[PDB]
């Protein structure tokens, strides 16, 4: 498939060159920027299970040696789908089972891959150890778990 | 900020452990999976400029030695914002100036960082060389550029 380009009518008289030069000139390891990452992983079976790791960040350095790994939300469910607004807008899960909010996984990059790969091969153990090391109780039903709350009706 | 967790009422009697074990067991370098990445970079000034690189992929190997770098859409504009559906759902640009569709940047990871960093410091030249090497004409106004089309009214 050949590359196609869409432009706002305000830039009709610009070239790619004159647009990007202007964008580059009007913009201003991180410093001093806003950056955000969304990773989506899903299976190939029907009603496929999926998960999303996401985070965003301010500006400059490690906080445990990762730039794109500044992850603070982790979500599990089924049916990854494209967001409104097109492919550029990333993904959402159609069926959301569990969402971890303010779960700082930045320090498990430099362990998150072992956790995600484990998950894909039927093994939650490394993910569970990461969660336990943050003080999360993984052996309590969600209904009794203090930091957990139920979504209204379905999402 | 302390971690909080949200769950669908169907999993009220599950623990994190029994949920993730079940999810792990019902799931099934890539093989044989659906994976997707969204990178968002924005400035810290008012009406901040922003860009989004996004792609997704099927299953197993290099196609020029990158897994998360399987990028085929690139979008420039202003005002990065959170998608409907919460932080997990990633970002969109409120003001979209230009979108490159089916622009395969996977082979510029192993050059994309030099391009993005250039952009941030007022220099489009490395981005323009990547585009030129794909056969894109960067010195033609969008209105005359054959592969380009105008968005209706504003987006
Ligand atoms: C905006 C588009 C960008 C894209 C598409 C992109 C993509 C990537 C890819 C594919 C990798 C290696 C593999 C992976 O992601 O798993 C990577 C690594 C890395 N990138 Fe970027 N990147 C972008 C912007 C930036 C910027 C602006 C910076 C720094 C100012 C940066 C800093 C880094 C660093 C430090 C790594 C090494 C691993 C890490 O700490 O995450 N990237 N990027
Ligand atoms: C689902 C959650 C995942 C997260 C949050 C995540 C995050 C990251 C991060 C932070 C890096 C290095 C820096 C960067 O992204 O720029 C990375 C690199 C890498 N990851 Fe992942 N990853 C995930 C899933 C996976 C899976 C399932 C695989 C393979 C089956 C994988 C394979 C790789 C490889 C090969 C690299 C080296 C650079 C590249 O080719 O992109 N990742 N990942």
CSV table of C-alpha atoms and ligand atoms in Angstrom, one decimal:
chain,number,residue,atom,x,y,z
A,1,UNK,CA,0.0,0.0,0.0
A,2,UNK,CA,1.3,3.4,-1.1
A,3,UNK,CA,1.6,6.3,1.3
A,4,UNK,CA,-1.2,8.8,1.3
A,5,UNK,CA,-1.3,12.2,3.2
A,6,UNK,CA,-4.1,14.2,4.6
A,7,UNK,CA,-3.9,17.9,5.3
A,8,UNK,CA,-5.9,20.6,6.9
A,9,UNK,CA,-7.0,23.3,4.4
A,10,UNK,CA,-5.0,25.9,6.2
A,11,UNK,CA,-1.8,24.2,5.0
A,12,UNK,CA,-2.8,23.8,1.4
A,13,UNK,CA,0.0,26.1,0.1
A,14,UNK,CA,2.7,24.5,2.3
A,15,UNK,CA,5.0,21.6,1.2
A,16,UNK,CA,6.0,18.8,3.6
A,17,UNK,CA,9.3,20.6,3.9
A,18,UNK,CA,7.9,24.1,4.7
A,19,UNK,CA,5.3,22.6,7.1
A,20,UNK,CA,7.8,20.5,9.1
A,21,UNK,CA,10.3,23.3,9.2
A,22,UNK,CA,7.7,25.6,10.6
A,23,UNK,CA,6.5,22.9,13.1
A,24,UNK,CA,10.1,22.2,14.1
A,25,UNK,CA,10.9,25.9,14.7
A,26,UNK,CA,7.7,26.4,16.7
A,27,UNK,CA,8.0,23.4,18.9
A,28,UNK,CA,10.2,24.8,21.7
A,29,UNK,CA,16.6,11.7,27.0
A,30,UNK,CA,13.8,14.2,27.7
A,31,UNK,CA,13.9,18.1,28.3
A,32,UNK,CA,11.4,19.8,28.5
A,33,UNK,CA,8.7,17.7,27.0
A,34,UNK,CA,5.4,15.9,27.3
A,35,UNK,CA,5.6,12.3,26.2
A,36,UNK,CA,3.1,9.4,26.3
A,37,UNK,CA,3.1,5.7,25.4
A,38,UNK,CA,0.4,3.2,24.8
A,39,UNK,CA,1.3,-0.5,24.3
A,40,UNK,CA,-1.5,-2.9,23.3
A,41,UNK,CA,-1.1,-6.7,23.1
A,42,UNK,CA,-3.9,-9.0,22.0
A,43,UNK,CA,-4.4,-12.6,20.9
A,44,UNK,CA,-5.5,-14.0,17.5
A,45,UNK,CA,-8.4,-16.1,18.7
A,46,UNK,CA,-12.1,-15.1,18.5
A,47,UNK,CA,-13.2,-12.8,21.3
A,48,UNK,CA,-9.4,-12.2,21.8
A,49,UNK,CA,-8.0,-11.3,25.2
A,50,UNK,CA,-6.1,-8.1,25.3
A,51,UNK,CA,-4.1,-5.8,27.6
A,52,UNK,CA,-3.0,-2.2,27.5
A,53,UNK,CA,-0.1,-0.7,29.3
A,54,UNK,CA,0.0,3.2,29.2
A,55,UNK,CA,1.7,6.1,30.7
A,56,UNK,CA,2.8,9.6,30.1
A,57,UNK,CA,5.5,11.9,31.5
A,58,UNK,CA,7.1,15.4,31.9
A,59,UNK,CA,10.8,16.0,31.3
A,60,UNK,CA,14.4,14.8,31.4
A,61,UNK,CA,15.7,11.6,33.0
A,62,UNK,CA,15.7,8.0,34.2
A,63,UNK,CA,13.2,7.5,37.1
A,64,UNK,CA,14.6,3.9,36.9
A,65,UNK,CA,16.2,4.2,33.4
A,66,UNK,CA,13.3,4.2,30.9
A,67,UNK,CA,11.8,6.9,28.7
A,68,UNK,CA,8.9,5.1,27.0
A,69,UNK,CA,8.4,2.7,29.9
A,70,UNK,CA,7.0,5.5,32.1
A,71,UNK,CA,3.9,3.3,32.6
A,72,UNK,CA,1.3,4.0,35.3
A,73,UNK,CA,-1.9,2.3,34.0
A,74,UNK,CA,-2.4,-1.3,33.2
A,75,UNK,CA,-5.7,-2.8,31.9
A,76,UNK,CA,-6.9,-6.2,31.1
A,77,UNK,CA,-9.9,-7.5,29.1
A,78,UNK,CA,-11.0,-8.4,25.6
A,79,UNK,CA,-11.4,-7.1,22.1
A,80,UNK,CA,-8.9,-4.5,21.3
A,81,UNK,CA,-10.4,-1.9,19.0
A,82,UNK,CA,-9.3,1.4,17.2
A,83,UNK,CA,-10.3,4.6,18.9
A,84,UNK,CA,-12.6,7.2,17.4
A,85,UNK,CA,-10.4,9.5,15.3
A,86,UNK,CA,-8.6,6.8,13.4
A,87,UNK,CA,-5.5,4.7,13.6
A,88,UNK,CA,-3.4,7.6,15.0
A,89,UNK,CA,-5.6,7.7,18.1
A,90,UNK,CA,-4.5,4.2,19.3
A,91,UNK,CA,-6.6,1.5,20.9
A,92,UNK,CA,-9.1,0.7,23.6
A,93,UNK,CA,-10.5,-2.5,25.0
A,94,UNK,CA,-14.2,-3.1,24.1
A,95,UNK,CA,-14.6,-5.3,27.2
A,96,UNK,CA,-12.7,-4.0,30.2
A,97,UNK,CA,-12.3,-6.5,33.1
A,98,UNK,CA,-9.8,-4.9,35.4
A,99,UNK,CA,-7.9,-1.6,35.4
A,100,UNK,CA,-4.8,-0.7,37.6
A,101,UNK,CA,-4.6,3.0,38.2
A,102,UNK,CA,-1.4,4.7,39.4
A,103,UNK,CA,0.6,1.5,39.2
A,104,UNK,CA,4.1,2.7,38.6
A,105,UNK,CA,5.9,0.1,36.4
A,106,UNK,CA,8.7,2.4,35.2
A,107,UNK,CA,11.2,0.6,37.5
A,108,UNK,CA,10.5,-2.8,36.0
A,109,UNK,CA,12.2,-1.7,32.7
A,110,UNK,CA,16.0,-1.7,32.4
A,111,UNK,CA,10.8,-7.0,35.2
A,112,UNK,CA,7.9,-6.2,32.9
A,113,UNK,CA,8.8,-8.2,29.7
A,114,UNK,CA,9.2,-11.4,31.7
A,115,UNK,CA,5.8,-10.5,33.2
A,116,UNK,CA,4.0,-9.9,29.9
A,117,UNK,CA,5.7,-12.9,28.2
A,118,UNK,CA,4.7,-15.0,31.2
A,119,UNK,CA,1.2,-13.9,30.8
A,120,UNK,CA,1.0,-14.9,27.2
A,121,UNK,CA,2.2,-18.4,28.0
A,122,UNK,CA,-0.2,-19.1,30.8
A,123,UNK,CA,2.0,-17.8,33.6
A,124,UNK,CA,0.9,-14.9,35.8
A,125,UNK,CA,3.6,-15.5,38.4
A,126,UNK,CA,6.2,-12.8,37.4
A,127,UNK,CA,3.4,-10.2,37.0
A,128,UNK,CA,2.0,-11.1,40.4
A,129,UNK,CA,5.5,-10.7,42.0
A,130,UNK,CA,5.8,-7.2,40.5
A,131,UNK,CA,2.4,-6.4,42.0
A,132,UNK,CA,3.3,-7.9,45.4
A,133,UNK,CA,6.5,-6.0,45.6
A,134,UNK,CA,4.5,-2.7,45.3
A,135,UNK,CA,2.4,-3.8,48.3
A,136,UNK,CA,-0.6,-5.0,46.4
A,137,UNK,CA,-2.4,-7.9,47.9
A,138,UNK,CA,-3.0,-10.4,45.1
A,139,UNK,CA,-4.9,-13.1,47.1
A,140,UNK,CA,-8.0,-11.1,48.2
A,141,UNK,CA,-11.2,-11.1,46.3
A,142,UNK,CA,-11.8,-7.7,44.5
A,143,UNK,CA,-15.0,-7.2,46.5
A,144,UNK,CA,-13.0,-7.4,49.7
A,145,UNK,CA,-9.8,-5.7,48.4
A,146,UNK,CA,-9.5,-2.3,50.0
A,147,UNK,CA,-7.9,-0.5,47.0
A,148,UNK,CA,-10.4,-2.0,44.5
A,149,UNK,CA,-13.7,-0.6,43.5
A,150,UNK,CA,-16.4,-1.9,41.2
A,151,UNK,CA,-17.3,-0.3,37.8
A,152,UNK,CA,-21.0,0.7,37.5
A,153,UNK,CA,-23.1,-2.0,35.8
A,154,UNK,CA,-20.5,-2.9,33.0
A,155,UNK,CA,-17.8,-0.2,32.4
B,1,UNK,CA,-0.5,8.6,44.8
B,2,UNK,CA,-1.5,5.1,45.9
B,3,UNK,CA,-2.5,2.4,43.4
B,4,UNK,CA,-6.3,1.9,43.0
B,5,UNK,CA,-8.0,-0.9,41.0
B,6,UNK,CA,-11.3,-1.0,39.1
B,7,UNK,CA,-13.1,-4.2,38.3
B,8,UNK,CA,-16.1,-5.4,36.3
B,9,UNK,CA,-18.8,-6.8,38.6
B,10,UNK,CA,-18.4,-10.2,36.9
B,11,UNK,CA,-15.0,-10.6,38.6
B,12,UNK,CA,-16.1,-9.5,42.1
B,13,UNK,CA,-15.2,-12.9,43.6
B,14,UNK,CA,-11.8,-13.2,41.9
B,15,UNK,CA,-8.5,-12.1,43.3
B,16,UNK,CA,-5.8,-10.5,41.2
B,17,UNK,CA,-4.1,-13.8,41.3
B,18,UNK,CA,-7.1,-15.9,40.1
B,19,UNK,CA,-8.0,-13.3,37.5
B,20,UNK,CA,-4.6,-13.1,36.0
B,21,UNK,CA,-4.1,-16.9,36.1
B,22,UNK,CA,-7.3,-17.3,34.2
B,23,UNK,CA,-6.5,-14.5,31.8
B,24,UNK,CA,-3.0,-16.0,31.2
B,25,UNK,CA,-4.4,-19.5,30.6
B,26,UNK,CA,-7.0,-18.2,28.1
B,27,UNK,CA,-4.8,-16.0,26.1
B,28,UNK,CA,-3.4,-18.5,23.6
B,29,UNK,CA,9.9,-11.5,19.7
B,30,UNK,CA,6.3,-12.1,18.6
B,31,UNK,CA,4.3,-15.3,17.8
B,32,UNK,CA,1.3,-15.4,17.2
B,33,UNK,CA,0.0,-12.0,18.5
B,34,UNK,CA,-1.6,-8.7,17.8
B,35,UNK,CA,0.5,-5.8,19.1
B,36,UNK,CA,0.1,-2.0,18.8
B,37,UNK,CA,2.0,1.1,19.8
B,38,UNK,CA,1.2,4.7,20.1
B,39,UNK,CA,3.9,7.3,20.9
B,40,UNK,CA,2.9,10.9,21.6
B,41,UNK,CA,5.4,13.8,22.0
B,42,UNK,CA,4.2,17.3,22.8
B,43,UNK,CA,5.7,20.6,24.0
B,44,UNK,CA,5.2,22.5,27.3
B,45,UNK,CA,4.2,25.8,25.8
B,46,UNK,CA,0.6,27.1,25.5
B,47,UNK,CA,-1.3,25.7,22.5
B,48,UNK,CA,1.5,23.1,22.4
B,49,UNK,CA,2.6,21.4,19.2
B,50,UNK,CA,2.4,17.7,19.2
B,51,UNK,CA,3.0,14.6,17.1
B,52,UNK,CA,1.8,11.0,17.2
B,53,UNK,CA,3.6,8.0,15.8
B,54,UNK,CA,1.4,4.8,15.7
B,55,UNK,CA,1.4,1.4,14.3
B,56,UNK,CA,0.2,-2.2,14.9
B,57,UNK,CA,1.3,-5.6,13.8
B,58,UNK,CA,0.7,-9.4,13.5
B,59,UNK,CA,3.2,-12.0,14.5
B,60,UNK,CA,6.9,-13.0,14.9
B,61,UNK,CA,10.0,-11.2,13.7
B,62,UNK,CA,12.2,-8.3,12.5
B,63,UNK,CA,10.8,-6.6,9.4
B,64,UNK,CA,13.9,-4.4,10.0
B,65,UNK,CA,14.6,-5.4,13.6
B,66,UNK,CA,11.9,-3.7,15.6
B,67,UNK,CA,8.9,-4.9,17.6
B,68,UNK,CA,7.3,-1.7,19.0
B,69,UNK,CA,8.7,0.4,16.1
B,70,UNK,CA,6.2,-1.2,13.7
B,71,UNK,CA,5.0,2.3,12.9
B,72,UNK,CA,2.8,3.1,9.8
B,73,UNK,CA,1.0,6.4,10.7
B,74,UNK,CA,2.5,9.7,11.6
B,75,UNK,CA,0.5,12.8,12.6
B,76,UNK,CA,1.4,16.3,13.3
B,77,UNK,CA,-0.6,19.1,14.9
B,78,UNK,CA,-1.4,20.7,18.3
B,79,UNK,CA,-3.0,20.0,21.7
B,80,UNK,CA,-2.5,16.4,22.7
B,81,UNK,CA,-5.5,15.2,24.7
B,82,UNK,CA,-6.7,12.0,26.5
B,83,UNK,CA,-9.0,9.8,24.5
B,84,UNK,CA,-12.5,9.1,25.6
B,85,UNK,CA,-12.4,6.0,27.9
B,86,UNK,CA,-9.6,7.2,30.1
B,87,UNK,CA,-5.9,7.3,30.4
B,88,UNK,CA,-5.7,3.6,29.2
B,89,UNK,CA,-7.1,4.7,25.8
B,90,UNK,CA,-4.1,6.8,24.9
B,91,UNK,CA,-4.0,10.2,23.2
B,92,UNK,CA,-5.3,12.2,20.2
B,93,UNK,CA,-4.4,15.6,18.7
B,94,UNK,CA,-7.2,18.2,19.2
B,95,UNK,CA,-5.9,20.1,16.2
B,96,UNK,CA,-4.7,17.9,13.3
B,97,UNK,CA,-2.6,19.5,10.7
B,98,UNK,CA,-1.1,16.7,8.6
B,99,UNK,CA,-1.5,12.9,8.7
B,100,UNK,CA,0.8,10.4,6.9
B,101,UNK,CA,-1.0,7.1,6.3
B,102,UNK,CA,0.8,3.9,5.4
B,103,UNK,CA,4.2,5.4,6.0
B,104,UNK,CA,6.3,2.4,7.0
B,105,UNK,CA,8.9,3.7,9.5
B,106,UNK,CA,9.8,0.2,10.9
B,107,UNK,CA,13.1,0.2,9.1
B,108,UNK,CA,14.2,3.5,10.6
B,109,UNK,CA,14.6,1.8,14.0
B,110,UNK,CA,17.7,-0.4,14.8
B,111,UNK,CA,16.8,6.8,11.6
B,112,UNK,CA,13.6,7.9,13.5
B,113,UNK,CA,15.2,9.1,16.8
B,114,UNK,CA,17.5,11.4,15.0
B,115,UNK,CA,14.4,12.6,13.0
B,116,UNK,CA,12.2,13.2,16.1
B,117,UNK,CA,15.0,14.8,18.1
B,118,UNK,CA,15.8,17.0,15.1
B,119,UNK,CA,12.3,18.1,14.9
B,120,UNK,CA,12.3,19.1,18.6
B,121,UNK,CA,15.3,21.4,18.1
B,122,UNK,CA,14.1,23.2,15.0
B,123,UNK,CA,15.5,20.8,12.5
B,124,UNK,CA,13.3,18.9,10.0
B,125,UNK,CA,16.2,17.7,7.8
B,126,UNK,CA,16.6,14.1,9.0
B,127,UNK,CA,12.8,13.6,8.9
B,128,UNK,CA,12.7,15.0,5.4
B,129,UNK,CA,15.5,12.6,4.3
B,130,UNK,CA,13.5,9.6,5.7
B,131,UNK,CA,10.5,10.8,3.7
B,132,UNK,CA,12.5,11.4,0.5
B,133,UNK,CA,14.0,8.0,0.7
B,134,UNK,CA,10.5,6.5,0.5
B,135,UNK,CA,9.8,8.4,-2.7
B,136,UNK,CA,7.8,11.1,-1.1
B,137,UNK,CA,8.1,14.5,-2.7
B,138,UNK,CA,8.7,17.0,0.1
B,139,UNK,CA,9.0,20.2,-2.0
B,140,UNK,CA,5.5,20.3,-3.6
B,141,UNK,CA,2.6,22.2,-2.1
B,142,UNK,CA,0.0,19.8,-0.5
B,143,UNK,CA,-2.7,21.1,-2.9
B,144,UNK,CA,-0.5,20.0,-5.9
B,145,UNK,CA,0.9,16.9,-4.2
B,146,UNK,CA,-0.6,13.8,-5.9
B,147,UNK,CA,-0.6,11.5,-2.8
B,148,UNK,CA,-2.1,14.3,-0.6
B,149,UNK,CA,-5.8,15.1,0.0
B,150,UNK,CA,-7.5,17.8,1.9
B,151,UNK,CA,-9.6,17.1,5.1
B,152,UNK,CA,-13.2,18.3,4.8
B,153,UNK,CA,-13.6,21.8,6.5
B,154,UNK,CA,-11.3,21.2,9.6
B,155,UNK,CA,-10.8,17.5,10.4
C,1,LIG,C1,7.9,10.4,18.7
C,1,LIG,C2,8.2,9.3,18.2
C,1,LIG,C3,9.1,8.2,18.8
C,1,LIG,C4,9.1,7.0,18.4
C,1,LIG,C5,8.1,6.4,17.3
C,1,LIG,C6,10.0,6.2,19.2
C,1,LIG,C7,10.2,4.8,19.1
C,1,LIG,C8,11.1,4.1,19.9
C,1,LIG,C9,11.4,2.7,19.7
C,1,LIG,C10,10.8,1.8,18.7
C,1,LIG,C11,12.4,2.4,20.6
C,1,LIG,C12,13.1,1.1,20.9
C,1,LIG,C13,12.1,0.0,21.1
C,1,LIG,C14,10.8,0.2,21.8
C,1,LIG,O1,10.1,1.2,21.8
C,1,LIG,O2,10.4,-0.8,22.5
C,1,LIG,C15,12.7,3.6,21.4
C,1,LIG,C16,13.6,3.6,22.4
C,1,LIG,C17,14.1,4.7,23.1
C,1,LIG,N1,13.7,6.0,22.8
C,1,LIG,FE1,12.1,6.5,21.5
C,1,LIG,N2,10.6,7.0,20.1
C,1,LIG,C18,10.1,8.3,19.9
C,1,LIG,C19,10.5,9.5,20.6
C,1,LIG,C20,11.6,9.6,21.5
C,1,LIG,C21,12.1,10.8,22.1
C,1,LIG,C22,11.6,12.2,21.7
C,1,LIG,C23,13.1,10.4,22.9
C,1,LIG,C24,14.0,11.3,23.8
C,1,LIG,C25,14.0,12.6,23.9
C,1,LIG,C26,13.2,9.0,22.9
C,1,LIG,C27,14.1,8.3,23.7
C,1,LIG,C28,14.3,6.9,23.7
C,1,LIG,C29,15.1,6.2,24.6
C,1,LIG,C30,15.9,6.7,25.8
C,1,LIG,C31,14.9,4.7,24.3
C,1,LIG,C32,15.6,3.5,25.0
C,1,LIG,C33,14.6,2.7,25.8
C,1,LIG,C34,13.7,3.6,26.7
C,1,LIG,O3,14.3,4.2,27.6
C,1,LIG,O4,12.5,3.6,26.5
C,1,LIG,N3,12.3,8.5,22.0
C,1,LIG,N4,11.9,4.6,20.9
C,2,LIG,C1,2.4,-5.2,26.8
C,2,LIG,C2,3.3,-4.5,27.5
C,2,LIG,C3,4.7,-4.1,27.0
C,2,LIG,C4,5.3,-3.0,27.4
C,2,LIG,C5,4.7,-2.0,28.4
C,2,LIG,C6,6.6,-3.0,26.8
C,2,LIG,C7,7.5,-2.0,26.9
C,2,LIG,C8,8.8,-1.9,26.3
C,2,LIG,C9,9.8,-0.9,26.6
C,2,LIG,C10,9.7,0.3,27.6
C,2,LIG,C11,10.8,-1.3,25.8
C,2,LIG,C12,12.2,-0.6,25.7
C,2,LIG,C13,12.1,0.9,25.4
C,2,LIG,C14,11.0,1.4,24.5
C,2,LIG,O1,9.8,1.0,24.4
C,2,LIG,O2,11.4,2.4,23.8
C,2,LIG,C15,10.6,-2.5,25.1
C,2,LIG,C16,11.5,-3.0,24.2
C,2,LIG,C17,11.3,-4.2,23.5
C,2,LIG,N1,10.2,-5.0,23.7
C,2,LIG,FE1,8.4,-4.5,24.8
C,2,LIG,N2,6.8,-4.1,25.9
C,2,LIG,C18,5.6,-4.8,26.0
C,2,LIG,C19,5.4,-6.0,25.4
C,2,LIG,C20,6.3,-6.7,24.6
C,2,LIG,C21,6.1,-8.1,24.0
C,2,LIG,C22,4.8,-8.9,24.2
C,2,LIG,C23,7.2,-8.4,23.3
C,2,LIG,C24,7.6,-9.6,22.5
C,2,LIG,C25,6.9,-10.7,22.4
C,2,LIG,C26,8.1,-7.2,23.4
C,2,LIG,C27,9.4,-7.2,22.8
C,2,LIG,C28,10.3,-6.1,22.9
C,2,LIG,C29,11.5,-6.0,22.1
C,2,LIG,C30,12.0,-7.0,21.0
C,2,LIG,C31,12.1,-4.7,22.5
C,2,LIG,C32,13.5,-4.2,21.9
C,2,LIG,C33,13.2,-3.0,20.9
C,2,LIG,C34,12.1,-3.2,19.9
C,2,LIG,O3,12.3,-4.1,19.0
C,2,LIG,O4,11.0,-2.5,20.0
C,2,LIG,N3,7.5,-6.3,24.2
C,2,LIG,N4,9.3,-2.8,25.4
